[PDB]
């Protein structure tokens, strides 16, 4: 059986696929899918940045999609911000 930490990491994959499976390339999250992801999965202080702003930051190759690696940029940034809030 996996540890709680390993299960958390595998669950992050599952969160991405919840949105990547919606349409198109199933290893791609499109702009509207990201808005849904942010609204549903992220805290207020992450949502406040706005879905279009986040999409442009995450879509590093400007191909109109956020792949899983690009999604992990959001995860990194959410983790750093959440850790800062936890210490405050």
């Amino acid at each position: 059986m996996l540890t709680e930490l390993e299960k958390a990491l595998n669950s992050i994959i599952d969160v991405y696929n919840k949105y990547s499976l919606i349409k198109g390339n199933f290893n791609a999250v499109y702009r509207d899918d990201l808005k849904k992801l942010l609204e549903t999965e992220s805290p207020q202080y992450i949502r406040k940045k706005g879905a279009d702003v986040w999409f442009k930051e995450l879509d590093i190759n400007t191909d109109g999609a956020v792949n899983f690696q690009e999604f992990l940029i959001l995860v990194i940034k959410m983790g750093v911000a959440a850790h800062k809030k936890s210490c405050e």
Binding site: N10, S11, I13, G79
Partner: protein, 91 residues
């Protein structure tokens, strides 16, 4: 809290469970990092855990400010790399 937020809180709380046990309560020294990897990544880093040299290579590469301690900001890069690698393995 969403599924994603709960997963991030698990990462944060796991890090803090080790970073608090010694020295600066918000950073991991080499010994606490090795203990974390050995216990909480015993499957994802199963092969690496057998070669303490490889684990030290991982630490040094994450320790971007070269202070022999891992901040959460340095540490989360490993979390993202292992999430990516898990996905690759399951596929």
């Amino acid at each position: 809290m969403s599924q994603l937020e709960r997963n991030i809180e698990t990462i944060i709380n796991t890090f803090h469970q080790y970073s608090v046990k010694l020295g600066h309560p918000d950073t991991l020294n080499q010994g606490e990092f090795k203990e974390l990897v050995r216990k909480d990544l015993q499957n994802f880093l199963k092969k690496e855990n057998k070669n303490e040299k490889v684990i030290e290579h991982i630490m040094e590469d994450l320790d971007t400010n070269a202070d022999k301690q891992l901040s959460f900001e340095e540490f989360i890069m490993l979390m993202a790399r292992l999430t990516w690698a898990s996905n690759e393995k399951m596929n």
